[PDB]
Amino acid sequence: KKMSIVLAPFSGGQPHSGVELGPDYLLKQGLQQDMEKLGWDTRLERVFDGKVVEARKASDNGDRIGRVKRPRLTAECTEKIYKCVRRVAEQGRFPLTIGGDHSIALGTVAGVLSVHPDAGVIWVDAHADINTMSGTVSGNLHGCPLSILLGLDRENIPECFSWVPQVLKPNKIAYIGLRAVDDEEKKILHDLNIAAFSMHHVDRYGIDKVVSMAIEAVSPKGTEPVMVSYDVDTIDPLYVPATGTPVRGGLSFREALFLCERIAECGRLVALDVVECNPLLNDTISVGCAIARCMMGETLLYT
Amino acid sequence: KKMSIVLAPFSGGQPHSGVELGPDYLLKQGLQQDMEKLGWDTRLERVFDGKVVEARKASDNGDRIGRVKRPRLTAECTEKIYKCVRRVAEQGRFPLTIGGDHSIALGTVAGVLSVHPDAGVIWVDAHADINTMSGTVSGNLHGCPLSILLGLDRENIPECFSWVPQVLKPNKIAYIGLRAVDDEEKKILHDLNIAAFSMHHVDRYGIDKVVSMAIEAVSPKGTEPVMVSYDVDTIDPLYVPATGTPVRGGLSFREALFLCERIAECGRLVALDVVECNPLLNDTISVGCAIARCMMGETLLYT
Amino acid sequence: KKMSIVLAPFSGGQPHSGVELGPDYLLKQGLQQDMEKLGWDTRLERVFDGKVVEARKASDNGDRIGRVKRPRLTAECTEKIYKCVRRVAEQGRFPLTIGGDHSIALGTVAGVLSVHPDAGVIWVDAHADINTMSGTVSGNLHGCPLSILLGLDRENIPECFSWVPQVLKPNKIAYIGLRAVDDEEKKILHDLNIAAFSMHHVDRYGIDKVVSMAIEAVSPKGTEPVMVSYDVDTIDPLYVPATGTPVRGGLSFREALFLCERIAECGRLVALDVVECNPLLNDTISVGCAIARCMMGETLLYT
Ligand SMILES: N[C@@](CCCC[B-](O)(O)O)(C(=O)O)C1CCN(Cc2ccc(Cl)c(Cl)c2)CC1
Ligand SMILES: N[C@@](CCCC[B-](O)(O)O)(C(=O)O)C1CCN(Cc2ccc(Cl)c(Cl)c2)CC1
Ligand SMILES: N[C@@](CCCC[B-](O)(O)O)(C(=O)O)C1CCN(Cc2ccc(Cl)c(Cl)c2)CC1
Ligand SMILES: [Mn+2]
Numbered sequence: 001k002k003m004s005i006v007l008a009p010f011s012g013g014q015p016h017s018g019v020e021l022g023p024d025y026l027l028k029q030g031l032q033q034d035m036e037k038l039g040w041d042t043r044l045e046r047v048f049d050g051k052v053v054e055a056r057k058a059s060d061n062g063d064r065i066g067r068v069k070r071p072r073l074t075a076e077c078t079e080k081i082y083k084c085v086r087r088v089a090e091q092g093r094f095p096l097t098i099g100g101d102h103s104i105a106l107g108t109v110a111g112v113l114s115v116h117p118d119a120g121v122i123w124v125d126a127h128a129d130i131n132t133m134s135g136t137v138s139g140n141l142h143g144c145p146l147s148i149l150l151g152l153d154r155e156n157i158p159e160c161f162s163w164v165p166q167v168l169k170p171n172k173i174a175y176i177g178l179r180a181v182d183d184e185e186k187k188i189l190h191d192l193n194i195a196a197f198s199m200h201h202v203d204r205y206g207i208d209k210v211v212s213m214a215i216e217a218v219s220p221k222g223t224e225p226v227m228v229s230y231d232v233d234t235i236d237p238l239y240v241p242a243t244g245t246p247v248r249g250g251l252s253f254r255e256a257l258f259l260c261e262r263i264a265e266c267g268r269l270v271a272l273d274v275v276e277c278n279p280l281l282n283d284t285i286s287v288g289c290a291i292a293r294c295m296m297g298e299t300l301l302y303t
Numbered sequence: 304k305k306m307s308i309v310l311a312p313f314s315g316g317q318p319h320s321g322v323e324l325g326p327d328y329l330l331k332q333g334l335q336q337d338m339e340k341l342g343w344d345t346r347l348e349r350v351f352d353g354k355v356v357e358a359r360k361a362s363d364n365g366d367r368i369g370r371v372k373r374p375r376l377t378a379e380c381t382e383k384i385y386k387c388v389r390r391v392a393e394q395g396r397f398p399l400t401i402g403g404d405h406s407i408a409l410g411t412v413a414g415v416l417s418v419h420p421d422a423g424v425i426w427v428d429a430h431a432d433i434n435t436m437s438g439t440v441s442g443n444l445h446g447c448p449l450s451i452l453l454g455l456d457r458e459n460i461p462e463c464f465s466w467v468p469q470v471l472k473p474n475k476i477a478y479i480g481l482r483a484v485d486d487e488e489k490k491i492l493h494d495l496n497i498a499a500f501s502m503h504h505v506d507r508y509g510i511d512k513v514v515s516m517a518i519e520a521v522s523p524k525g526t527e528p529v530m531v532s533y534d535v536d537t538i539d540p541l542y543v544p545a546t547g548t549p550v551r552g553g554l555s556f557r558e559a560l561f562l563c564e565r566i567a568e569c570g571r572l573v574a575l576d577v578v579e580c581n582p583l584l585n586d587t588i589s590v591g592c593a594i595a596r597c598m599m600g601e602t603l604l605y606t
Numbered sequence: 607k608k609m610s611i612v613l614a615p616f617s618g619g620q621p622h623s624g625v626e627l628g629p630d631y632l633l634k635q636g637l638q639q640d641m642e643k644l645g646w647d648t649r650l651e652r653v654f655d656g657k658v659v660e661a662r663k664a665s666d667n668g669d670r671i672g673r674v675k676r677p678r679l680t681a682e683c684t685e686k687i688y689k690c691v692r693r694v695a696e697q698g699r700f701p702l703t704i705g706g707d708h709s710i711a712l713g714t715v716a717g718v719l720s721v722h723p724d725a726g727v728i729w730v731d732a733h734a735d736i737n738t739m740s741g742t743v744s745g746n747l748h749g750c751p752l753s754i755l756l757g758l759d760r761e762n763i764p765e766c767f768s769w770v771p772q773v774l775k776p777n778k779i780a781y782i783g784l785r786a787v788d789d790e791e792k793k794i795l796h797d798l799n800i801a802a803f804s805m806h807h808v809d810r811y812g813i814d815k816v817v818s819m820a821i822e823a824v825s826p827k828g829t830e831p832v833m834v835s836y837d838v839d840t841i842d843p844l845y846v847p848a849t850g851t852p853v854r855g856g857l858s859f860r861e862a863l864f865l866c867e868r869i870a871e872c873g874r875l876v877a878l879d880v881v882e883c884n885p886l887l888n889d890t891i892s893v894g895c896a897i898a899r900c901m902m903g904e905t906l907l908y909t
């Protein structure tokens with residue numbers, strides 16, 4: 001029962017600074033102490049210095065390819081995260097990665113699935129994060145990691161991302177909480193038959209049924225390891241106001257944590273990302289910590 | 304696939320001014336552009352000038368019969384709306400009427416059912432809007448349109464409302480979202496066996512079951528056209544603060560739009576009212592637009 | 607159909623003053639008038655003077671046994687409440703007790719079950735209120751009444767509580783709404799197999815199923831009288847901000863009142879506490895009144 005808390009203070013996936021402060025804020029909130037109380041032997045893993053990285057992010061406007069912003073810096077930092085997370089998983093430790101914007105998932109998902117090839121990925125997000133290189137409008141790479149992970153628009157992915165192993169398949173990723181999906185993304189999810197449970201489905205079936213369906217969708221044998229990549233903007237701005245891309249109307253605070261409890265309950269969680277905490281906009285950070293505690297086993301009654 | 308956006312800037316059904324600004328605010332928010340994007344060939348229909356009408360509303364205190372306020376002005380303006388909506392439906396266009404207080408529904412429901420006799424009416428509201436002429440306490444006619452439409456308290460309805468066709472029957476109207484029903488209204492709903500799904504039923508069965516039951520209640524053959532008259536005060540003041548008669552605790556923003564999606568889904572929507580937007584109290588107007596988009600086919604994933 | 611509104615202005619169960627103002631605030635809000643409208647012949651019962659009691663509470667810091675605060679004052683005041691509530695029930699009247707912090711339930715539960723031995727108790731609360739004398743950390747007795755009622759940690763309950771009849775058994779108490787349960791309390795609920803429906807269960811099954819399961823848990827014959835002790839902090843601080851121990855994320859305003867309607871519906875409610883209203887922190891007091899009205903029969907539609 002060992003855990004590595006992977007610190008990924010990266011902001012180059014989106015315009016706003018402050019999200020790179022995520023990891024330190026979560027840790028100051030007592031994240032590591034929380035995990036130890038739940039019985040986890042923890043250690044911290046520093047992938048890079050957030051301030052040095054932020055310096056290059058803020059300065060280097062020339063880091064563009066087409067509409068895509070910072071593909072070089074992002075490719076470098078996410079390869080670092082990949083190597084770290086992969087080693088953690090090979091060591092037999094649980095990789096709990098704290099972001100940082102969601103572009104870091106390019107490294108975390110690649111890292112985990114390289115060790116666990118049949119791992120399912122549950123993407124908890126208001127967004128699909130699957131815009132292609134030529135398809136993206138904002139050019140913000142935190143809205144693109146799944147397209148790169150899936151190898152979509154192959155001929156337009158820059159050489160600096162050549163390091164990304166092709167280990168994720170469309171039938172191994174399930175969305176929960178979608179409500180701001182771009183037109184291009186809509187077509188992609190449809191064409192690729194990706195399991196997508198939007199807010200419509202949560203409203204229609206309830207969060208318990210949705211989580212069950214999401215788990216089943218990425219675990220046919222019912223035995224597969226499961227990874228969750230958790231964007232805090234899935235949770236309605238009423239609870240998560242300090243996040244870069246707030247969307248209504250999202251998960252309640254209750255649904256957001258219940259989701260974690262159902263996942264913890266299934267006992268097959270192998271890795272977790274908690275991303276897009278931007279402290280410069282207590283609630284957002286305490287929600288991040290709460291997600292961690294519930295995911296890693298904290299319950300309301302005796303266990 | 305043609306639509307007429309019927310502008311009904313009327314405020315004479317209730318004391319507060321500002322609700323007559325509804326139509327222009329929704330249009331400035333981009334309502335017409337939204338409908339065109341969804342594939343609708345649209346055009347605007349101006350029934351009357353809201354400023355001229357508001358002038359007579361604010362001045363003419365003598366327009367009273369008993370406790371009922373502005374029965375003459377209301378009867379005149381709603382007859383205009385009736386003739387417009389009826390012609391739109393006869394032209395084979397979808398009447399999307401923007402209010403304006405809910406007294407305009409006297410014209411919209413009469414207009415639609417005169418063309419579609421077997422159309423069901425789903426009344427989304429915190430209130431029953433079915434107080435009679437002699438029964439009303441406030442005397443505000445936006446809380447009375449269904450009594451007139453149903454022909455209740457026949458001997459006490461003023462001659463100026465003689466134009467109203469008797470086309471609505473009690474078994475063709477279903478409420479969703481009730482939580483502030485007057486004692487007299489309670490008795491009426493009971494005595495007439497009107498399908499009424501209060502917040503209790505939403506809490507008990509969930510919004511999906513409630514919407515299903517409401518649709519079934521007004522469509523026995525499962526083939527009948529369906530009209531929705533949507534009062535924005537059904538939605539909890541937390542989401543719709545700028546409305547004349549706010550009531551707790553109502554539909555969530557999510558339930559309010561999910562309702563629209565289920566209706567759009569059934570494919571039998573023939574007309575829609577969006578009423579009681581009072582901008583003088585972004586959320587309320589954007590909610591009004593959102594209701595329209597979801598009702599007319601906008602989905603979270605690919606369609 | 608007779609009711610006694612038992613006024614229990616007690617604050618000695620917790621540090622904060624103001625909760626003793628509960629009863630008067632609820633009454634000024636029109637609590638008694640509300641009950642009369644619902645058909646109840648009401649009368650007020652003053653157990654003690656809240657100002658005189660508050661005077662001794664604020665002054666007497668020496669009233670401690672170990673970590674437990676004010677065991678003497680609490681034992682005295684709750685014995686008074688016990689004798690009052692017991693007499694009310696023997697008179698054949700409905701005891702509706704307004705607090706006051708939740709330590710008053712030591713008197714109300716004892717009073718009711720002494721007259722109705724097979725009565726079930728539904729404890730609506732964010733907390734378990736079952737910390738023992740030696741187990742409590744805060745030493746606040748409003749978090750301890752159920753341990754005393756159940757006779758737990760027998761050898762450490764002060765002599766001043768010797769008056770408490772042992773009438774409550776573990777299989778006759780059901781929780782609804784738990785989300786802040788101490789580690790010691792968790793073990794107790796588990797060891798004693800007490801029916802506990804946390805926010806997890808509300809999230810998982812919905813409030814209707816939870817209330818049904820709670821009623822069944824304390825009423826095997828399906829005939830037993832039912833008592834509800836309602837802590838207003840069960841309701842999310844968004845609706846109940848003026849309460850001493852606010853916890854997220856709790857019941858919605860809708861769930862909180864729906865709960866009351868289901869209970870009223872079963873027709874076996876024999877007594878009700880409404881506690882922990884602390885006006886010095888309109889919403890909180892109006893919620894208290896609303897709980898009362900819904901519990902005692904108020905419905906959204908005709909009845
Ligand atoms: N996809 C985005 C954001 C990417 C989010 C990255 B994440 O915060 O890590 O999930 C990107 O920058 O690529 C934008 C693109 C433009 N849309 C516009 C929009 C607004 C409202 C609605 Cl309902 C819809 Cl369907 C679309 C918002 C997300
Ligand atoms: N019916 C009303 C409002 C009519 C609303 C028109 B609508 O905004 O278009 O739906 C009218 O003016 O005729 C009043 C009458 C007095 N009641 C008092 C009341 C307050 C709280 C509760 Cl829980 C209940 Cl049951 C009743 C409010 C609505
Ligand atoms: N049990 C309490 C409060 C008793 C409430 C009395 B009531 O307001 O009448 O229900 C007492 O003073 O005895 C405290 C003890 C310390 N816990 C700490 C805590 C905080 C958050 C969580 Cl999630 C958990 Cl599990 C525990 C809070 C309640
Ligand atoms: Mn994301």
Ligand SMILES: [Mn+2]
Nearest residue numbers: 126127231233
């Ligand atoms: Mn997102």
Ligand SMILES: [Mn+2]
Nearest residue numbers: 405428432534
């Ligand atoms: Mn209305």
Ligand SMILES: [Mn+2]
Nearest residue numbers: 429430534536
């Ligand atoms: Mn209304």
Ligand SMILES: [Mn+2]
Nearest residue numbers: 708731735837
């Ligand atoms: Mn309590």
Ligand SMILES: [Mn+2]
Nearest residue numbers: 732733837839
């Ligand atoms: Mn409590």
